[PDB]
Design a binder for this molecule. Structure first.
Ligand SMILES: Nc1nc2c(ncn2[C@@H]2O[C@H](COP(=O)(O)OP(=O)(O)O)[C@@H](O)[C@H]2O)c(=O)[nH]1
Ligand SMILES: [Mg+2]
Length: 165
């Protein structure tokens, strides 16, 4: 009866990929986490009464140039593309990442993290929303400081997978 899913969390460095995943997995907000390592977390969750075992591939992070390794496209059932609402460069980069990803595969969602930082925000909600609409993808904003927003992210990619499945 059980169901395994492997999810890759992509984005520019310091957007909060690790912080988000850890919020969800451990239920606590981390400051000290190293941006170099790739890590793979597990979690169990029930979505519409189906129990999933999630493998969450928190990538180191990438930029305009870096080429996709094969762990970014083999055996992946969902992608979470994260930018930070405080970094325009993170937002330009995530459009690049999304382009490369369609070519390197031939269920993706977009998350604008760090929404709690109202004095540093330089990307509007609607910019993110418009972009994901342009990809035909789900969009959420999140704060790694706020558990429900991180839970909502990872739940959402499963919900997205259930339709596209
Ligand atoms: N205020 C705030 N800080 C965050 C958020 N997400 C990540 N951070 C911080 O931003 C820095 C980079 O986070 P990290 O998860 O390492 O980004 P990664 O490099 O994409 O994994 C760390 O100091 C985090 O504590 C958020 O939603 N809100
Ligand atoms: Mg990290």
């Amino acid at each position: 009866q059980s169901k395994s899913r492997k999810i890759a969390i992509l984005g520019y460095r310091s957007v909060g990929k690790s912080s988000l995943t850890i919020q969800f997995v451990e239920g606590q907000f981390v400051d000290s986490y190293d941006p170099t390592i790739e890590n793979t977390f597990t979690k169990l969750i029930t979505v519409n009464g189906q129990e999933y075992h999630l493998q969450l591939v928190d990538t180191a992070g990438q930029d305009e140039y870096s080429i996709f390794p094969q762990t970014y496209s083999i055996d992946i059932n969902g992608y979470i593309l994260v930018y930070s609402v405080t970094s325009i460069k993170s937002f330009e980069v995530i459009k690049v990442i999304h382009g490369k990803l369609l070519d390197m595969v031939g269920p993706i969602m977009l998350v604008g993290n760090k929404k709690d930082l109202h004095m540093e925000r330089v990307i509007s909600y609607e910019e993110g929303k418009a972009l994901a609409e342009s990809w035909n993808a789900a969009f959420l904003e999140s704060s790694a400081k706020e558990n429900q927003t991180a839970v909502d992210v990872f739940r959402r990619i499963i919900l997205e997978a259930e339709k596209l499945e």
